[PDB]
Amino acid sequence: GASIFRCRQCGQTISRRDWLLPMGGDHEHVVFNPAGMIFRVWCFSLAQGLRLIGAPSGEFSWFKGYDWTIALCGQCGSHLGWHYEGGSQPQTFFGLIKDRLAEGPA
Ligand SMILES: O=C1CC[C@H](N2C(=O)c3ccccc3C2=O)C(=O)N1
Ligand SMILES: [Ca+2]
Ligand SMILES: [Cl-]
Ligand SMILES: [Cl-]
Ligand SMILES: [Cl-]
Ligand SMILES: [Cl-]
Ligand SMILES: [Cl-]
Ligand SMILES: [Cl-]
Ligand SMILES: [Cl-]
Ligand code: NI
Ligand SMILES: [Zn+2]
């Protein structure tokens, strides 16, 4: 059974369970933004359906050695998470907010 992560707002296909990545040994990280809100961040090696906004930034990065850019759903513009770059093994990956996705069957 393929298990698809869809944009919770609009239903667009974004990623799948098979594309989870154990970043630092763990494909689901618990992180705090600077306002103190807690996110569960799924780590994916690949994703579809995403528009990236801005130049990379390293500030506040939750993943050492990686800079982020904001990832929006291309269809509806929901803020789904971030793309990470500038690392090694892998160079890049996606960190997507669990509450902003919905996991279900194909
Ligand atoms: O790895 C990341 C991605 C971006 C994220 N981030 C936020 O969630 C945020 C909210 C408010 C102002 C500034 C930021 C910031 O860098 C953050 O804290 N770390
Ligand atoms: Ca975890
Ligand atoms: Cl899958
Ligand atoms: Cl990590
Ligand atoms: Cl964690
Ligand atoms: Cl944190
Ligand atoms: Cl969350
Ligand atoms: Cl952000
Ligand atoms: Cl949103
Ligand atoms: Ni895993
Ligand atoms: Zn969407």
Author numbering: 18 to 123
Quote the authors verbatim:
Ito et al. showed that cereblon associates with damaged DNA binding protein 1 (DDB1) to act as a substrate receptor for the DDB1/cullin4 E3 ubiquitin ligase complex. In mammals, cereblon has a LON domain and a C-terminal thalidomide binding domain. However, homologs of the latter, also termed the CULT domain, are further found in animals and bacteria as single-domain proteins, that have all essential residues of the thalidomide binding site conserved. Architecturally, the thalidomide binding domain is a member of the β-tent fold, which consists of two antiparallel beta sheets that are oriented at an approximately right angle and pinned together at the top via a structural zinc ion.
We now obtained a new, trigonal crystal form of MsCI4•thalidomide that yielded a dataset with a resolution of 1.2 Å. The crystals contain one monomer in the asymmetric unit (ASU) in space group P3221, which has the same conformation as in all other known co-crystal structures of MsCI4. This structure superimposes closely with the 3 other monomers of MsCI4•thalidomide from the orthorhombic crystal form and the 2 further new MsCI4•thalidomide monomers described below. However, between all structures, there is a significant difference in the conformation of the thalidomide molecule: while the glutarimide moieties superimpose tightly, the phthaloyl moieties protruding from the binding pocket differ in their orientation by up to 13°. This angular freedom is especially apparent in the atomic resolution electron density. An obvious rationale for this conformational freedom lies in the lack of specific interactions of the phthaloyl moiety with the protein.
